[PDB]
Design a protein around this nucleic acid. Sequence first.
DNA 1: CATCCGAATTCG
DNA 2: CATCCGAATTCG
Lengths: 246, 248
Amino acid sequence: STISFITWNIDGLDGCNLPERARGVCSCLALYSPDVVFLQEVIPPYCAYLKKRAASYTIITGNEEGYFTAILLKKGRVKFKSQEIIPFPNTKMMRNLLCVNVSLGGNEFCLMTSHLESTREHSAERIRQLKTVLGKMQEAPDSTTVIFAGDTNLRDQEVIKCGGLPDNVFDAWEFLGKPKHCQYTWDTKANNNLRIPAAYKHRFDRIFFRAGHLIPQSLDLVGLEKLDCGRFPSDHWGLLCTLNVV
Amino acid sequence: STISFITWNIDGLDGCNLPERARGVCSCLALYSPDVVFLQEVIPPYCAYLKKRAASYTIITGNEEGYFTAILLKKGRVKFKSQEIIPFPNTKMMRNLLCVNVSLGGNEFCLMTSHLESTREHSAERIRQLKTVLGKMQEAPDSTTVIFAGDTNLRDQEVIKCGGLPDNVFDAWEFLGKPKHCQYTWDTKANNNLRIPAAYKHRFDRIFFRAEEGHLIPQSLDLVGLEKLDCGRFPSDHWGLLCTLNVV
DNA sequence: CATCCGAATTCG
DNA sequence: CATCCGAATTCG
Ligand SMILES: [Mg+2]
Ligand SMILES: [Mg+2]
Ligand SMILES: [Mg+2]
Ligand SMILES: [Mg+2]
């Protein structure tokens, strides 16, 4: 009666120490052994690495132009049924919504990920993309459990500007009472991969789910351990979440 | 019967061709002979020049640190009564509100000018300053006619963001039906003093007046400072605004 | 003695 | 092969 998953922007666009960082991401995958992994900022060579070092995950992608998202499904645990790609017609960064329908146990899921439009200056487009995601979450068949997990790039004000989440969609971190230990998934004071001398902190990485049949049990940051090469696996922390279906 | 005035950011911060440009500004003052002139971005030497080349105007200033505003009063037409400076506590650019009470044509006026906080990213402070100005315009007794004219640096929606003009305060341009001939007072297409390649057009320079019972009615609004000087540059990067109003 | 537009870029 | 924060600066 459970699903566990990681969502993680793994910064494929950072060319520094990629082999070692991919190894570290694959270490987290082996150690935490989630059913599903949502990845953003993947690049082709990174896929090839996951194919050898996380071989028990099926990699589902849509378009692979430049950098992209992927959903990884644990073989034997998760059965793929179908995929759907929802475009963001006004994106300037090749962003979109990747949806995968799966079965895990006797439970049907619609798993979605995206990397929403980046940077402060593209707030209006990022908000339009969010609304597109939220609308698609609501369209899913009543019997299916919908989970979105991704790099939303959202900051102060924006979700409110959007009019807030609909009454049957919830943010897992909010649902769990806004625990302080995972309140930031991108934090330049704690993570120095970008060498930014300022301390800025954001909750860019978020999980939304439609529902009280679905109950988040835990949420934790992963990728917190600096690698021997002196770099974190990514500039983002990953999020590990377990949900119970009641 | 009337009042005429010019408001003009004369770009004292542009150090090139200042003497010819000052000569150009003084030419406009002689030719249009306004009762009052509201100037922004004045610098000390520029004041010195006006005292010689527009010597029939009394120059009224508040603080003179760096660059500043001034209000010029035509000697014999306008009688100075008093001045008041209202500070903008959160300014990072030494901006403030300069108010001068005067008598003109047997009528009493409170004339105000300011150079509101500059640049796009200082919208919040600029809006707070606008509120301060608009609030100050309501304080004078109804008998006194209140006129604000200055470089407001305002752009799209900022006035709405502020709650809009109160019901007894009007923008002279809007009042006159938004005439296209003087819409933009800062225009990089038509004015090349900053040599900006792009075409940006703004209405930074604005005139607000308090009416109530229609005792003050704008008659005309025109751009001044449109004539290129011998050096192939204009007096300022802004056009000035010449306005005439009837006291009814 | 300088600033000013604003999209792109730099740099802390 | 790159991006990414955000204030400050560059340059069209
Ligand atoms: Mg990145
Ligand atoms: Mg200037
Ligand atoms: Mg600037
Ligand atoms: Mg940037």
